[PDB]
Write a protein that binds this ligand. Structure first.
Ligand code: HEM
Ligand SMILES: CC(C)=CCC[C@@H](C)[C@H]1CC[C@@]2(C)C3=C(CC[C@]12C)[C@@]1(C)CC[C@H](O)C(C)(C)[C@@H]1CC3
Length: 530
């Protein structure tokens, strides 16, 4: 009755194992995890308390390639195979996707104790924005930072920003090599070149003020670019490894935050605190409820985070608006008639209040945000085992949850002919977003308690965007001026480009070129330039 001999042979086998030729050893160093991963999945598939897990061949990598390149196609296939809740492996992580409005509710309205945005995002955002702010702090601190920033984002602020943003757009038409409207009546433009510039110029001028806008006319502008390079998904996978673009990122965060602090300290020194810009607002309103004041460094870092939050979302959105309208001269025409009607043939200066009487313009923004949600996936890290109603699924701590309102934006069930750009689907519904009932306040103002709307370009729950009205103001002014000034169309044989999903936002695949032409070739934009 001897197993003893077999145990001897276990030991022997280990010894012969260690003595394998490097050919066999490398071979087995690959072959063991490969096999184990596979039997682990087959085993995993037997659990009834886990959502189905998308099958994958390469350990750790998982479905990263297909998810990374075509997330909506990936989701549609998974949704056909498994239904609305399913998991997939992504560079060492397990992501549980919950598609549709029930998913919106499951993730956006998740208990503070159940999930963490900062645990999913901080390793990426902290090196770019700086310490102490956004995701480098407890959620309660984030809630109050959002309150502080919202305090510079009032209707009175927007009334004052509208002419500043209009001035910037006109200067860009006058001065940018991309246009030069006083010298050229037609031209070709890459919207992924122009829109990020127009976006940072307009947002700098209004939120940060004249000094910081002036800085963007210099080599200082390059820092923003560098800062931008730290804000990509390789950093999402490697938050730090020793590469130059990381160092340029850190340097840029320091130099830019340094410039912000210099202005702030100069203002406090000269008692030159007004109500002009978000800087003046944070200088007056940045004490948390426990009485601790944000430091000047944290104020600057928060300024960087806020501007970054508006930068890629807004730039991508105006790129897509231009791109969709480039093949819809009927829509340009309709928007132009609205401009002439609301602004008395141009004899009225554009104001914030008049932007609110441009429903077609606002529906154009809304519809572009439907077809092109800038963020295809939003994440949380699961901190406590979560039960999914009405199921037997448990999402264990250590998993991530992924919600995709932009995928639902593109489903025929919620938006008939979802792949058709139709601003009129929003007729009698021009609002950037509508809370369809009860509200709740997480610390930065009353917002919709339910997050079941199939349309959620600005998310929902405690992490909801606070920049929505700024974005509509900025996009509104910008597009109002584009429409009143220019007609545009595609080069022959060109059409709307497919999205690039690999980037930080779902921007168009470039070069995405449009040809513009002046509606009034003889019109001059005044003011001095060199
Ligand atoms: C078209 C324009 C925009 C879109 C579609 C958009 C979208 C979003 C979304 C979906 C979220 C939720 C993120 C999550 O739940 O994980 C969010 C959060 C946020 N965004 Fe926006 N955004 C836009 C513009 C802006 C602008 C213009 C600003 C600043 C002026 C801004 C600043 C913020 C801030 C501070 C948050 C809060 C993040 C948090 O609480 O974790 N965004 N945005
Ligand atoms: C491989 C790919 C494209 C994965 C998609 C993940 C990113 C593209 C998205 C998901 C989370 C995301 C929406 C986020 C942001 C940008 C785009 C992200 C990283 C940022 C960091 C933008 C800056 C903003 O201030 C804020 C901090 C609110 C968000 C946070 C989440």
């Amino acid at each position: 009755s001897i197993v003893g001999e077999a145990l001897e042979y276990v030991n022997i086998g280990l010894s012969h194992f260690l003595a394998l030729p490097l050919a066999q050893r490398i071979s087995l160093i690959i072959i063991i995890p490969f096999i184990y991963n596979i039997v682990w999945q087959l085993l995993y598939s037997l659990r009834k308390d886990r959502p189905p897990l998308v099958f994958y061949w390469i350990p750790w990598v998982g479905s990263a390639v297909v998810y990374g390149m075509k997330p909506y196609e990936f989701f549609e296939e998974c949704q056909k195979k498994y239904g609305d809740i399913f998991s997939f492996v992504l560079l060492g992580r397990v992501m549980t996707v919950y598609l549709g409005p029930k998913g919106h509710e499951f993730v956006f309205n998740a208990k503070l104790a159940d999930v963490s945005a900062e645990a999913a995002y901080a390793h990426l955002t902290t090196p770019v924005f700086g310490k102490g702010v956004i995701y480098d702090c407890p959620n309660s601190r984030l809630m109050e930072q959002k309150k502080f920033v919202k305090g510079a984002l009032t209707k009175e602020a927007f009334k004052s920003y509208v002419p500043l943003i209009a001035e910037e757009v006109y200067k860009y038409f006058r001065d940018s090599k991309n246009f030069r409207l006083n010298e050229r009546t037609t031209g070709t433009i890459d919207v992924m070149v122009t829109q990020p510039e127009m976006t940072i110029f307009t947002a700098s001028r209004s939120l940060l003020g004249k000094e910081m806008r002036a800085k963007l006319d210099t080599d200082f502008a390059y820092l923003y670019s560098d800062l931008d390079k730290g804000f990509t998904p390789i950093n999402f996978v490697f938050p730090n490894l020793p590469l130059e673009h990381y160092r340029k990122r850190d340097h840029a965060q320091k130099a830019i935050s340094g410039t912000y602090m210099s202005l702030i300290k100069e203002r406090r020194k000269n008692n030159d605190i007004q109500d002009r810009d978000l800087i003046d607002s944070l200088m007056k309103n940045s004490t948390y409820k426990d009485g601790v004041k944000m430091t000047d460094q944290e104020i600057a870092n928060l300024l960087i985070g806020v501007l970054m939050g508006g930068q890629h979302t807004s730039a991508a959105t105006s790129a897509w608006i231009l791109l969709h309208l480039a093949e819809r001269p009927d829509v340009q025409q309709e928007l132009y008639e609205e401009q002439m009607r609301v602004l008395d043939g141009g004899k009225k200066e554009l104001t914030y209040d008049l932007l609110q009487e441009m429903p077609l313009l606002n529906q154009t923004i809304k519809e572009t945000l439907r077809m092109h949600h800038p963020l295809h996936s939003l994440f949380r890290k699961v901190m406590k085992d979560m039960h999914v109603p009405n199921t037997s699924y448990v999402i264990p701590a250590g998993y991530h949850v992924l919600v995709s309102p932009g995928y639902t934006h593109l489903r025929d069930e919620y938006f008939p002919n979802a792949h058709q750009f139709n601003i009129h689907r929003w007729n009698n519904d021009s609002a950037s977003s509508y809370s369809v009932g009860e509200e709740v306040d997480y610390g930065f103002g009353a917002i919709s308690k339910g997050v079941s709307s199939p349309y959620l370009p600005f998310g929902g729950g405690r992490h909801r965007c606070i920049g929505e009205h700024f974005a509509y103001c900025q996009l509104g002014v910008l597009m109002s001026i584009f429409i009143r000034t220019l007609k545009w169309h595609y080069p022959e044989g060109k059409t709307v480009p497919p999205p690039d999903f690999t980037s930080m936002v779902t921007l168009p695949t470039g070069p995405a070129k449009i040809i513009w032409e002046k509606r009034n070739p003889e019109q001059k934009i005044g003011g001095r330039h060199h």
